């Protein structure tokens, strides 16, 4: 803490069910290492019984 | 489930979000389930694995109908008398 | 005065009987969109009919439609001459 | 959206007549731009009536 | 006045409608309640549609042919409140259906989890919200255009 | 017993004591003025 | 078929199971381990008792063996084999090949996944209209 | 294509997730890590029919999957026979 990890993130791949609606982050990766880190969550559910899905730093874009 | 099992609540559950199949109605919201449940209010896959009661439920539902015909048709017989 | 409705309800069944499902979804969102702009929808994820529910709302209507049609057609040709 | 939407993001490279898809997601059906054309032709047979 | 023939003051075709029809529903010579206390064609059902009369009100009211009334609703002559009078009324009532729609809704999403409050309904009709709707003067009619729901909320 | 900032709940269809009734009181205005099709004012 | 009875697995008769084009195409028999003799569900409306082995009944089409399999591992055991027979023996050898129980690694085989590009924005349409210069055939 | 319905996701982990499907899928290939790191959309698919039982369970997080080969076998049909 003292930069920010999971405050609030919009989503913009334009497949994501949530897409824009901007909700919940979670334990986003501490690596240099891959291309699909970041969990996120929001309550607006989605098309499957369970959705909370993981998204990566491209782009991915704002808040701001 | 556990609002609170067995021995120690008389206290009824009305509330906390309610029931079926184990990833039970989510918490998180949907419409379909309001259509589920009128449908397949009894199927008897669920409520218990073990027939146990149900025969102990279907005798009661039967009673309700016999009354009801009766509520009926008093009505009818009324109507017919007065 | 029934014979038109229920001779309508039937000819409403086909809509429920003859149609897709992610269709009224695909539609239900355009809706859900317009809804969010004014801030008036999301909570209780509004969802289209449960493939087989849609069939449940065929059939059932196709019958209480196509049937009372004659329940009318009949009581109307024995009351009065016959 | 013959190009397609949320319930289908993909729905493409056959855009038109791919009629049907698997059950699950919400339950998915006459959601090809053909089956809306398919669905359309009932009201063109109801107006034009 | 505008084409369908004119009001009550004369609409013969209309007159003929008054008369045959109801007056015959009469024309069951009797069917007998010479005292009798129940059967009510007799009194009103006619008379309640019947002591409709060279009066109805008066109401103007256009009476096409067959002397059934047609409603122009122009802003003229007699006819203004066959749409506006009961038009703004429709508007006012609705919108205070949904002003509170956009209310026993924008009051939750909040605190500790609100995932289906909505299917039981604390307080019913919101009520509290309810009266907001008559106590709209202006209400949305400026606040919707500025602030709150505001273009940003757009 | 209910003061300020929303109150107690209610069931699935209290709409069936809202279609029936409230709305019901309205026939009750459609016989007081047994008729409409325009209306005088007050 | 008397002069050779090889049989391990025990129906009696049914209307069910394979009719002629299993001979003219591709054959599809499944085989297994067993403990002590039990009475089973089938494909094809039902049922039989097993004992032992080869324990090598043959089925119509591949969906049917695997289908027991679910069938066969509730009520358990490890060991189920399903092979594909022709008329004319081999190629396409079906459960034998490496390991079994998909959900392990030795190797890749297979699959890719992506074609040329990944899931993201095919909002982009199909492109050049089929010519035999550009990599559109895999 | 001759069976091309994308169920891919990102985790391609398969524990309390998805297995269901008559033969078609051997996966568990790994790809050089993803958490659980069993990846890909598929094993070689010229074997079985066209379910979407393929998701129904364990994410695809774009498209569902479905009918579409077109180019259609008999063995891939169910009926020849
Ligand atoms: C003596 C037997 C009787 C009994 C005791 C049962 C009992 C049962 N049936 Mg059943 N059934 C019966 C006769 C009976 N059935 C008959 C004659 C048929 C042929 C039509 C069926 C067809 C049937 C099906 C397809 C199913 C069942 C299922 C069930 C189970 C689910 C019950 C439920 O949730 O209610 C369901 C009732 C509703 C959800 C109420 C909706 C009723 C609508 C359609 C209204 C009907 C039209 C009417 C004119 C509307 C009122 C007027 C209106 C216009 C104002 C239950 C164990 C279900 C199951 O899954 O098994 C476990 C399955 O759905 N039944
Ligand atoms: C929304 C649609 C549009 C409309 C307005 C209609 C309307 C109609 N179609 Mg129709 N149709 C359409 C699109 C439409 N269609 C399309 C796209 C197709 C496919 C091409 C069809 C295929 C079709 C067929 C095959 C038929 C119709 C028929 C009908 C008519 C039935 C007669 C009637 O209603 O008398 C009007 C009078 C009344 C409704 C009086 C109502 C009084 C009663 C019901 C009481 C008051 C209501 C109360 C709430 C009911 C009690 C319920 C209570 C328990 C709450 C009706 C005019 C049928 C017909 O009659 O001839 C073709 C015929 O079956 N349609
Ligand atoms: C009270 C309302 C709420 C509000 C503010 C709106 C508002 C809107 N709806 Mg809508 N809708 C609602 C509930 C609401 N809806 C419900 C419950 C349904 C059933 C699924 C729909 C089904 C629906 C469809 C199909 C469409 C709309 C559309 C619209 C938009 C066009 C207005 C119109 O002509 O539709 C008139 C409104 C209706 C037909 C809705 C009827 C239900 C109302 C009477 C709910 C009444 C309040 C309810 C009892 C809440 C309880 C009160 C609570 C606080 C205690 C507008 C933004 C249209 C659109 O997308 O274009 C922008 C589209 O046509 N709605
Ligand atoms: C443009 C419109 C139109 C349409 C779409 C309809 C549609 C309908 N009418 Mg209808 N009708 C119309 C114009 C129309 N009508 C007109 C102008 C009139 C004159 C007033 C009527 C007078 C009328 C009456 C009196 C009745 C209907 C009924 C019906 C309904 C029966 C159809 C059905 O659902 O089962 C399909 C029906 C059948 C397969 C059986 C009917 C065929 C009969 C006539 C002869 C075949 C029997 C023969 C011995 C061999 C049997 C073969 C067997 C395998 C079926 C249907 C909703 C009736 C109803 O309630 O039906 C249940 C009621 O009988 N209509
Ligand atoms: C002829 C039919 C009839 C009869 C006799 C019953 C009888 C019953 N239904 Mg039932 N039901 C019916 C039609 C009927 N239903 C219909 C049309 C629907 C719409 C789908 C339902 C939907 C439904 C649901 C969701 C549930 C039941 C349940 C029950 C049981 C609960 C009794 C109770 O808890 O307190 C009795 C309480 C009172 C008499 C209080 C007064 C209530 C008003 C309406 C009078 C009882 C066996 C419950 C169950 O699972 O038990 C088997 C369950 O919650 N029903
Ligand atoms: C079988 C069915 C059932 C049905 C469908 C009806 C239907 C009706 N009853 Mg009724 N009734 C019933 C059972 C029923 N009753 C029973 C069991 C009793 C004994 C308690 C009565 C005692 C009763 C009385 C005293 C009255 C009715 C009246 C009525 C009519 C008035 C409508 C209404 O109730 O709401 C509104 C309506 C036709 C009313 C009537 O006949 O006047 C038109 C009259 O008020 N009913
Ligand atoms: C999937 C299902 C379908 C179903 C079963 C429902 C069911 C419901 N919707 Mg709804 N809705 C739908 C599709 C559906 N909707 C669609 C497609 C839209 C367009 C986005 C909406 C937009 C909408 C709005 C704006 C509202 C509802 C509301 C409601 C609830 C009002 C009933 C009520 O008055 O509560 C019990 C009785 C009372 C409230 C009377 C007092 C009810 C649970 C309302 C709600 O949730 O309550 C405030 C209202 O908010 N709906
Ligand atoms: C008064 C008479 C006239 C009125 C009758 C109504 C006719 C109006 C119908 C609306 C037009 C739709 C019909 C178009 C042809 C059928 C669908 C189609 O496009 O074909 C072909 C499409 C295929 O659809 C596409 O095809 C592409 C490749 O060509 C893709 O690969 C995909 O398969 C798909 O996207 O749909 C069908 O599969 C049709 C199969 C039906 C076979 C029945 C033969 C009967 C022929 C009639 C003889 C008389
Ligand atoms: C005079 C007159 C007229 C005229 C008309 C016109 C000219 C038209 C138009 C109109 C229009 C042009 C419309 C539109 C507008 C726009 C808009 C934009 C609107 C809006 C709105 C909204 C948004 C709403 C909302 C709400 C409310 C208010 C209620 C509750 C909530 C809600 C959400 C529902 C007519 C014809 C009638 C006839 C005669 C009379
Ligand atoms: C505007 C509006 C509206 C609308 C209305 C309408 C337009 C209607 C209609 C309707 C129609 C158009 C039709 C319907 C019909 C219905 C029905 C029909 C119901 C029921 C039934 C019954 C009760 C039956 C019985 C029976 C039996 C016993 C069995 C078989 C036979 C019979 C069927 C007889 C309302 C007011 C609502 C709301 C508000 C808005
Ligand atoms: C038309 C149609 C729909 C669309 C039909 C829908 C969305 C019907 C559901 C509408 C509900 C009943 C409206 C409920 C809203 C009110 C109950 C809420 C307010 C409460 C009141 C006081 C009015 C399908 O979902 C479908 C699914 C599968 C096969 C065919 C079809 C099909 O033909
Ligand atoms: S179903 Fe999806 S998430 Fe599950 S293992 Fe396969 S690819 Fe991964
Ligand atoms: S149903 Fe789909 S996923 Fe399953 S094996 Fe067949 S093609 Fe593969």
UniProtKB/Swiss-Prot annotation, chain B:
Localization terms from the record: Plastid, Chloroplast thylakoid membrane
Transmembrane regions listed in the UniProt entry: 58-81
Entry superkingdom: Eukaryota
Purpose of the protein: PsaA and PsaB bind P700, the primary electron donor of photosystem I (PSI), as well as the electron acceptors A0, A1 and FX. PSI is a plastocyanin-ferredoxin oxidoreductase, converting photonic excitation into a charge separation, which transfers an electron from the donor P700 chlorophyll pair to the spectroscopically characterized acceptors A0, A1, FX, FA and FB in turn. Oxidized P700 is reduced on the lumenal side of the thylakoid membrane by plastocyanin.
Membership in a protein family: Belongs to the PsaA/PsaB family.
Subunit note: The PsaA/B heterodimer binds the P700 chlorophyll special pair and subsequent electron acceptors. PSI consists of a core antenna complex that captures photons, and an electron transfer chain that converts photonic excitation into a charge separation. The eukaryotic PSI reaction center is composed of at least 11 subunits.
Name of the featured protein: Photosystem I P700 chlorophyll a apoprotein A1
Organism: Pisum sativum
Parent sequence residues shown: 21 to 102 of 758
Curated annotation (Swiss-Prot), chain C:
Residues engaged in binding phylloquinone: 24
UniProt-annotated binding residues for chlorophyll a': 7
Transmembrane feature ranges: 1-18, 56-77
Binding, chlorophyll a: 15, 23
Task of the protein: PsaA and PsaB bind P700, the primary electron donor of photosystem I (PSI), as well as the electron acceptors A0, A1 and FX. PSI is a plastocyanin-ferredoxin oxidoreductase, converting photonic excitation into a charge separation, which transfers an electron from the donor P700 chlorophyll pair to the spectroscopically characterized acceptors A0, A1, FX, FA and FB in turn. Oxidized P700 is reduced on the lumenal side of the thylakoid membrane by plastocyanin.
Assigned protein family: Belongs to the PsaA/PsaB family.
Protein name, entry field: Photosystem I P700 chlorophyll a apoprotein A1
UniProt source species: Pisum sativum (Garden pea)
Lineage: Eukaryota, Viridiplantae, Streptophyta, Embryophyta, Tracheophyta
Gene field: psaA
Included range, full protein: 677 to 758 of 758
UniProtKB/Swiss-Prot annotation, chain D:
Compartment annotation: Plastid, Chloroplast thylakoid membrane
Residues the entry annotates as binding [4Fe-4S] cluster: 20, 29
TM regions (residue ranges): 36-49
Organism superkingdom: Eukaryota
Coiled-coil intervals: none
Disulfide bonds: none
Subunit text: The PsaA/B heterodimer binds the P700 chlorophyll special pair and subsequent electron acceptors. PSI consists of a core antenna complex that captures photons, and an electron transfer chain that converts photonic excitation into a charge separation. The eukaryotic PSI reaction center is composed of at least 11 subunits.
Family: Belongs to the PsaA/PsaB family.
Functional description taken from the UniProt entry: PsaA and PsaB bind P700, the primary electron donor of photosystem I (PSI), as well as the electron acceptors A0, A1 and FX. PSI is a plastocyanin-ferredoxin oxidoreductase, converting photonic excitation into a charge separation, which transfers an electron from the donor P700 chlorophyll pair to the spectroscopically characterized acceptors A0, A1, FX, FA and FB in turn. Oxidized P700 is reduced on the lumenal side of the thylakoid membrane by plastocyanin.
Protein name: Photosystem I P700 chlorophyll a apoprotein A2
Native source organism of the sequence: Pisum sativum (Garden pea)
Highest classification ranks of the organism: Eukaryota, Viridiplantae, Streptophyta, Embryophyta, Tracheophyta
Parent-protein residues present: 540 to 588 of 734
From Swiss-Prot, chain H:
SUPFAM superfamilies the record matches: 4Fe-4S ferredoxins
Binding-site residues, [4Fe-4S] cluster 1: 11, 14, 17, 58
EC id: 1.97.1.12
Species this protein is from: Pisum sativum (Garden pea)
Record-linked PANTHER family: PHOTOSYSTEM I IRON-SULFUR CENTER, PHOTOSYSTEM I IRON-SULFUR CENTER-RELATED
Disulfide cysteine pairs (residue numbers): none
GO MF term list: 4 iron, 4 sulfur cluster binding; electron transfer activity; metal ion binding; oxidoreductase activity
Protein name per Swiss-Prot or TrEMBL: Photosystem I iron-sulfur center
UniProt-annotated location(s): Plastid, Chloroplast thylakoid membrane
């Amino acid at each position: 803490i003292g930069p920010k990890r999971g405050a609030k993130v919009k989503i913009l791949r334009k497949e994501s069910y949530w897409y824009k609606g901007t909700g919940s982050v979670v334990a986003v990766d501490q690596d240099p290492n891959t291309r699909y880190p970041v969990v996120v969550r929001f309550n607006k559910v989605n098309y499957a019984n369970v959705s909370t899905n993981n998204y990566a730093l491209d782009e991915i874009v704002e808040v701001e | 489930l556990v609002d609170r099992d067995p021995i120690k609540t008389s206290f009824e559950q009305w509330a906390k979000p309610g029931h079926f199949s184990r990833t039970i109605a989510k918490g998180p919201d949907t419409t379909t389930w309001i259509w589920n449940l009128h449908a397949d209010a009894h199927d008897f896959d669920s409520h218990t694995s073990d027939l146990e009661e149900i025969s102990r439920k279907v005798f009661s539902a039967h009673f309700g109908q016999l009354s009801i015909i009766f509520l009926w048709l008093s009505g009818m017989y009324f109507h017919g008398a007065r | 005065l029934f014979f038109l409705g229920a001779h309508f309800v039937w000819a409403f069944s086909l809509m429920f009987l003859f149609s897709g499902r992610g269709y009224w979804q695909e539609l239900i969102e355009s809706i859900v969109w317009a809804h969010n702009k004014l801030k008036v929808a999301p909570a209780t994820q509004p969802r289209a009919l449960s493939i087989v529910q849609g069939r449940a709302v065929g059939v059932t209507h196709y019958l209480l439609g196509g049937i009372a049609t004659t329940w009318a057609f009949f009581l109307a040709r024995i009351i009065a001459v016959g | 959206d013959a190009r397609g939407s949320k319930l289908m993001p993909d729905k493409k490279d056959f855009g038109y007549s791919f009629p049907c898809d698997g059950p699950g997601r919400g339950g998915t059906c006459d959601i090809s731009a053909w089956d809306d054309f398919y669905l359309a032709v009932f009201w063109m047979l109801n107006t034009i009536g | 006045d505008i084409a369908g023939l004119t009001p009550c003051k004369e609409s013969k075709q209309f007159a003929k409608r008054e008369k045959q029809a109801l007056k015959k529903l009469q024309a069951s010579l009797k069917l007998y309640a010479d005292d009798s206390a129940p059967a009510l064609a007799i009194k009103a059902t006619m008379e309640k549609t019947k002591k409709r009369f060279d009066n109805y009100g008066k109401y103007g009211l256009l009476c096409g042919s067959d002397g059934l009334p047609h409603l122009i609703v122009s802003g003229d002559q007699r006819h203004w409140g066959e749409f506006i009078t009961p038009g703004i009324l429709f508007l006012y009532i609705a919108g205070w259906i949904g002003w509170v729609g956009r209310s026993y809704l924008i009051a939750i999403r909040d605190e500790k989890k609100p995932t289906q409050k909505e299917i039981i309904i604390d307080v019913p009709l919101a009520s509290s919200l309810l009266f907001r709707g008559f106590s709209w003067p202006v209400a949305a009619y400026r606040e919707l255009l500025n602030g709150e729901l505001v273009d940003n909320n757009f | 017993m209910r003061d300020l900032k929303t109150y107690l709940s209610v069931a699935p269809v209290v709409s069936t004591l809202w279609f029936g009734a409230l709305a019901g009181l309205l026939i009750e205005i459609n016989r007081f003025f047994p008729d409409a099709l325009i209306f005088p004012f007050f | 078929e008397l002069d050779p009875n090889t049989p391990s697995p025990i129906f009696g008769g049914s209307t069910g199971g394979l009719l002629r084009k299993a001979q003219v195409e591709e054959f599809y028999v499944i085989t297994w381990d067993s403990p002590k003799e039990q009475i089973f569900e089938m494909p094809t409306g039902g049922a039989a008792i097993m004992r032992e082995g080869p324990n090598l009944l043959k089925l119509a089409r591949k969906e049917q063996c695997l289908a027991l399999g679910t069938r066969l591992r509730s009520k358990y055991k490890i060991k189920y084999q399903f092979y594909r027979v022709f008329p004319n023996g081999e190629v396409q050898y079906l459960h034998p090949k490496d390991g079994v129980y998909p959900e392990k690694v030795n190797a890749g085989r297979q699959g890719v996944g992506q074609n040329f590009r990944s899931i993201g924005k095919n909002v982009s349409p199909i492109e050049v209209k089929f010519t035999g210069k550009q990599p559109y055939d895999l | 294509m001759s069976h091309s319905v994308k169920i891919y996701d990102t985790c391609i982990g398969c524990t309390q997730c998805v297995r269901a499907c008559p033969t078609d899928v051997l996966e568990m290939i790994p790809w050089g890590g993803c958490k659980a790191k069993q990846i890909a959309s598929a094993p070689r698919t010229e074997d079985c029919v066209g379910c979407k039982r393929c998701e129904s369970a364990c994410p695809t997080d774009f498209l569902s999957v479905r009918v579409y080969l077109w180019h259609e076998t008999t063995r891939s049909m169910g009926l020849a026979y």
